[PDB]
Amino acid sequence: QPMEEEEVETFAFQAEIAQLMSLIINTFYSNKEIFLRELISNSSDALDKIRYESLTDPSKLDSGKELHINLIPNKQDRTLTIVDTGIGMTKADLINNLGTIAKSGTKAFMEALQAGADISMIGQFGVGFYSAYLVAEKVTVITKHNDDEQYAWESSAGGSFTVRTDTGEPMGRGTKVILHLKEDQTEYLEERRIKEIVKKHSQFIGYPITLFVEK
Numbered sequence: 001q002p003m004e005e006e007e008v009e010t011f012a013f014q015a016e017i018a019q020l021m022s023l024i025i026n027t028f029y030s031n032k033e034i035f036l037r038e039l040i041s042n043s044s045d046a047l048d049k050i051r052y053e054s055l056t057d058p059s060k061l062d063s064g065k066e067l068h069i070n071l072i073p074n075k076q077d078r079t080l081t082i083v084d085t086g087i088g089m090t091k092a093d094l095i096n097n098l099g100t101i102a103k104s105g106t107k108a109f110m111e112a113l114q115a116g117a118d119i120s121m122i123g124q125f126g127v128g129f130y131s132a133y134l135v136a137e138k139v140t141v142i143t144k145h146n147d148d149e150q151y152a153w154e155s156s157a158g159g160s161f162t163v164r165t166d167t168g169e170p171m172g173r174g175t176k177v178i179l180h181l182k183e184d185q186t187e188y189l190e191e192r193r194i195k196e197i198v199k200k201h202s203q204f205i206g207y208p209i210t211l212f213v214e215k
């Protein structure tokens with residue numbers, strides 16, 4: 001019954017990453033659907049990493065043998081969740097790779113946009129994760145790596161993100177991206193739309209992908 005206590009750490013995004021997020025959020029782009037391609041591609045890379053690590057150390061699969069991606073639309077919460085059982089990320093990985101450290105592709109990509117380039121090019125510049133903000137007002141990343149505890153990263157943009165130990169349902173290993181969709185982007189909760197986008201953009205994943213549909 002006693003009051004629970006939880007630690008949170010708040011971080012500022014690196015300057016160019018903050019500028020990138022603002023550009024993605026406040027500019028109109030057609031072809032926003034490519035966000036799902038980018039997230040699935042990141043999952044595939046995380047899956048490749050645990051796969052190859054396990055060839056040399058099979059104990060790394062003690063946290064889960066199955067290597068796959070699950071897509072979970074939730075119309076009640078208005079969330080689309082992409083879950084993989086890839087290598088996952090440590091706390092240090094989250095902090096370094098999801099916000100605080102500069103990427104070499106950020107500037108070149110922003111300038112490419114502000115010249116008319118299609119947003120689809122984002123993955124080539126190594127900042128494809130941020131395409132989530134084309135469709136989501138808030139993104140929560142839950143992750144579990146063999147070498148660390150389970151962590152939750154979250155940002156509604158505006159310049160900062162938080163990291164905390166996750167009190168939610170334990171995952172054996174991997175990463176779960178929860179997209180809290182903007183009110184005008186609920187088409188990405190529809191089964192037909194999700195299937196269309198995966199069929200169009202994500203046909204060479206290398207791992208099984210399953211769509212879970214309520215009701």
Ligand SMILES: COc1cc2cc(c1)NC(=O)/C(C)=C/CC[C@H](OC(N)=O)[C@@H](OC(N)=O)/C(C)=C/[C@H](C)[C@@H](OC)[C@@H](OC)COC2
Pocket residue numbers: 039041042043044045046049084086087088089093094097098126127128129130141175177
């Ligand atoms: C193309 O491949 C990459 C690689 C990187 C960045 C991006 C794409 N591109 C990005 O835009 C960023 C900021 C990705 C952040 C990291 C991704 O997180 C979300 N959910 O998309 C995460 O994905 C999942 N499912 O685990 C990935 C890919 C983690 C991999 C395994 C891990 O390698 C050891 C990361 O360092 C810890 C790599 O970071 C660099």
Ligand SMILES: [Mg+2]
Pocket residue numbers: 041044045
């Ligand atoms: Mg790949």
